[PDB]
Amino acid sequence: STSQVRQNYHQDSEAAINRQINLELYASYVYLSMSYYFDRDDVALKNFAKYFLHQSHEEREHAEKLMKLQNQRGGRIFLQDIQKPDCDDWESGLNAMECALHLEKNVNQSLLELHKLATDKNDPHLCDFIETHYLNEQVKAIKELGDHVTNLRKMGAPESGLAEYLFDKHTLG
Amino acid sequence: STSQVRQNYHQDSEAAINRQINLELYASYVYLSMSYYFDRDDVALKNFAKYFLHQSHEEREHAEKLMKLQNQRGGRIFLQDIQKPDCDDWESGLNAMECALHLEKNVNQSLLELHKLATDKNDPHLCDFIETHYLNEQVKAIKELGDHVTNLRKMGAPESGLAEYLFDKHTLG
Amino acid sequence: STSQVRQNYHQDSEAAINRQINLELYASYVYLSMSYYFDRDDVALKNFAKYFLHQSHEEREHAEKLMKLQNQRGGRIFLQDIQKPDCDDWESGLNAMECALHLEKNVNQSLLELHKLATDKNDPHLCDFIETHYLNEQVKAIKELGDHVTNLRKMGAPESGLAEYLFDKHTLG
Amino acid sequence: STSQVRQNYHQDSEAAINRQINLELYASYVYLSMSYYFDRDDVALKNFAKYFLHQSHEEREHAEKLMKLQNQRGGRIFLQDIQKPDCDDWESGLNAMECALHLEKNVNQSLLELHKLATDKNDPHLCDFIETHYLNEQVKAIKELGDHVTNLRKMGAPESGLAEYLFDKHTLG
Amino acid sequence: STSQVRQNYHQDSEAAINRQINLELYASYVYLSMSYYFDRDDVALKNFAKYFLHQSHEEREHAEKLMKLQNQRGGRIFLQDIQKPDCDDWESGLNAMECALHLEKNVNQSLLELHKLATDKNDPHLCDFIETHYLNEQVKAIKELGDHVTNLRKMGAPESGLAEYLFDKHTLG
Amino acid sequence: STSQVRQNYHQDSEAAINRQINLELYASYVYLSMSYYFDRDDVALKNFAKYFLHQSHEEREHAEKLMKLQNQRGGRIFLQDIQKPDCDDWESGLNAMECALHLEKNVNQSLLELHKLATDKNDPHLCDFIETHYLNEQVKAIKELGDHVTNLRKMGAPESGLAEYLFDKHTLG
Ligand code: NA
Ligand code: NA
Ligand code: NA
Ligand code: NA
Ligand code: NA
Ligand code: NA
Ligand code: NA
Ligand code: NA
Ligand code: NA
């Protein structure tokens, strides 16, 4: 049953990629939830909605790239349930940005664990794949979210609704 | 807690839209599974892979349009777990097309039930939304899948691997 | 023998579509007859001829769209004889426009009966198909013919041959 | 005295269309009043003025489309007095947006009553006309106004004149 | 309560402008009525319909320009009911043109009274506004309508329906 | 009652043209039937469907050209019922091509009989009309159909569904 393409690809690596696929699809779904929260008539921050929807689509592309890697290496994709996000109501633009920062750090920690596994199993193709396609993207996403959280807090969010309004217009618009 | 926009939108309709959102996201995930099955080195039908991946992205767009409708009407989106697809291994191009036809008929039956509810609750905006955006799209998808199943069976799939190869090239390419 | 695509499509609906196909092909043939009446050397109203020939081609397109619908829904097309039109000699431009108005109202009444059947059989795809593609087209055709009949009568048709001549040039040209 | 074009068009439907024409012309006139309130030297919110003037012109187009429908179906237009709006002085951008939301919900309720009448009189052309041209336009207008009301309230209108100023510039500009 | 912009603008002038706004909106509504009379299936003179609809839109622009003037001068707009037109059925193209000529002379007489008031109150800005934007427009409209009435009478309207038909095509088309 | 244009046009020729008009309209209707057979979900050969639909439209153009000839010569068009085609179900691409070849030979035999009549009645305009517009078109159609029948039989139709599939793609596509 070994794939004719499989070479230097450990079962532990294959299993870790399947876990990462699920985590990327989960992240996609959290961002989708946040997007449509900001589209509510009683929230009405269109640029927050657009920002999170773009993040949702990016996470789905990240999941699909891992699925392509699994097939390239001769692993087998096993999909799992995509859990519902932890909240239905994300409270404010600042609370959503803080939850996004927490989610991106969690994804990053998973990627760092996968890199460590690839290095331990002497799988340099997999380690390079993670470095090239995932680790700098996560560092940039974390820095961007931290920048957004800083600005919203300085402007007086979430107490001032003027803060979120102007951030929506000037930063996310 | 009633939305300032809400007018002539029954709680039963709101709940049915939340169910339909989950079913569209489920369909998306089934198509994603089928896509990456055809990308396996031991299957290697790139045009089947492309066809199912396009279907996956379309189902996600259909889910997002329902989420937009829920907010437009002043309903509240409640997301649920997205169940994993029923198979990991889709066996053949003909078996996948037959499973897709079965899935599209199941989605269609759900949409017909939603239309009936909208009509019973005297919600003509919702009934028109379903007619305009969903029902003809489902009829066309069903007819296209039935056409694909017919051609693959006539060509001698799944017994002849030449059949799937040539269908991949000439119909899906 | 049930089509693999067939879903929520009643035998009564299938039979009514076959009847409507025949009525559209009949209408096409009536308009063709009227067109070539106006092309006679002893009638010689080229713009009346062009108007009716365009109507003939439109009715054929309407018949073909119903045939496409029958196949999309998994019904089976059964064609019948196309009866000859009721007249060989249409007498005048005003008499032909009045016969066209009567024919378009007859087609409209058939379409309204089909819509009522679709609604009674809880077939919203079929009801929407009729609404979208047929009912507004028939209302516009009826209003246009009524406008033509009004103008020809006011101008003094069919007694004044100058009336039909000038209507041919200024309205239909 | 029956119009030569009239078919399946109930007197009750004809009367309801005449009422809807009056309500659309009334709405037009309310929006015109609001527009020129914001053009006052002691109010001076040019983008609010532009927004309401565009709404005024759209309502007039909606009235004219109903007048065209009445003639298409062979009904007879009976115009009534256009009542003056309920206010001369609209107080603030937030109060005007709230009055607009209330007016759009009132128009929507009238349209839903007309749709119900069309359905009860088995007039599918009229029901489809309302669905296609009016109901989704009203849902979008209501959602947009609710979004505007939400943002103005969050920003601190009408107490902060800075709120209305910045909303005028960033949302309506 | 005096506007910070108000200078040399008499209360009598302000009241006369409010009356003129109502008369322009009334004229708009009369022309709208006439337009849709000519769109009836039993009248069917499309170019008469287009001519009156353009006149309706022009009168609305004239009303809006007076509303802008009232605000420019620091007056306050008070809107009144827009009375329904005197007829539902305008009888013929010649009768409608004669009623339009009578309406335009009535508007002109009101404008001449406003000019006389502006001159009596030593308000040269208002007198110049009326001269520049209204008086030559009214003289041209009156002359054009008189020309139309003359031609229709000479051609044999309203007895000859051929006259109105050819006038519709050649003058108004 | 003789047409002012009629010259050297025998009653027998006029009657034969009326028969040929009916036969061309019949052929059109047979091709339309075959087209929509190939559009069925359980047949699904789109290029066969397109081929027959083009043939249907060409036969209608041939009928209209005969109607134009009848009027040019001062004959009178008498239309008859268009009989329904001999089959509802055309069985296979090879069986339909064989039925088309048989139909085109039948049309050709009728045209040869009309040419013989024109020659016997010393009507060189009519004989030239048939030669120029019909006889070479029929020879080319017959040769093309014979070529299609030969290729489908050689490829192993109708037993191999792969044959019809590949013919549909490579010859008719
Ligand atoms: Na990611
Ligand atoms: Na590296
Ligand atoms: Na879908
Ligand atoms: Na509809
Ligand atoms: Na039709
Ligand atoms: Na409206
Ligand atoms: Na004026
Ligand atoms: Na032919
Ligand atoms: Na020759």
N- to C-terminal separation of chain A?
A: 52 Å
**SSE string of chain A, helices as H and strands as E:** HHHHH
Output the number of helix runs of chain A: 5
Annotated CATH architecture of chain A: Up-down Bundle
How would the global form of chain A be characterised?
A: elongated
Greatest chain-chain contact: A-B, 32 and 32 residues
Task: Give Rg of chain A in angstroms.
Answer: 18 Å
Number of beta-strand segments of chain A:
0
CATH fold-level name of chain A: Ferritin
Oligomer: part of a larger assembly
Q: Identify the bound ligands.
A: sodium ion
Estimate nothing, just give the exact number of structural domains of chain A.
1
| Strand percent estimate of chain A | under 5%
Describe the structure.
Chains A, B, C, D, E, F: Residues 7-156 form the Ferritin-like diiron domain. Chains A, B, C, D, E, F: One of its GO terms (biological process) is negative regulation of ferroptosis. Chains A, B, C, D, E, F: Keywords: Acetylation, Cytoplasm, Cytoplasmic vesicle, Iron, Iron storage, Lysosome, Metal-binding, Neurodegeneration, Oxidoreductase, Phosphoprotein. Chains A, B, C, D, E, F: Its EC number is 1.16.3.1. This is part of a larger assembly, with six copies of chain A (173 residues). By secondary structure, the first copy, chain A, is mainly α. Chain A has a single domain (2-173), classed as Ferritin (Up-down Bundle). Chain A is built from five helices and no strands. The first copy, chain A, has helices spanning 11-38, 46-73, 93-120, 124-155, 161-170. In chain A, α1 runs antiparallel to α2 (46-73), α1 (11-38) packs antiparallel against α3 (93-120) and α3 (93-120) runs antiparallel to α4 (124-155). The radius of gyration of chain A is 18 Å and the shape is elongated. Chains in contact: A-B, A-D, B-C, B-D, B-F, C-D, C-E, C-F, D-E. Bound molecules: sodium ion (9 copies). One sodium ion binds at residues 128, 131 of chain F.
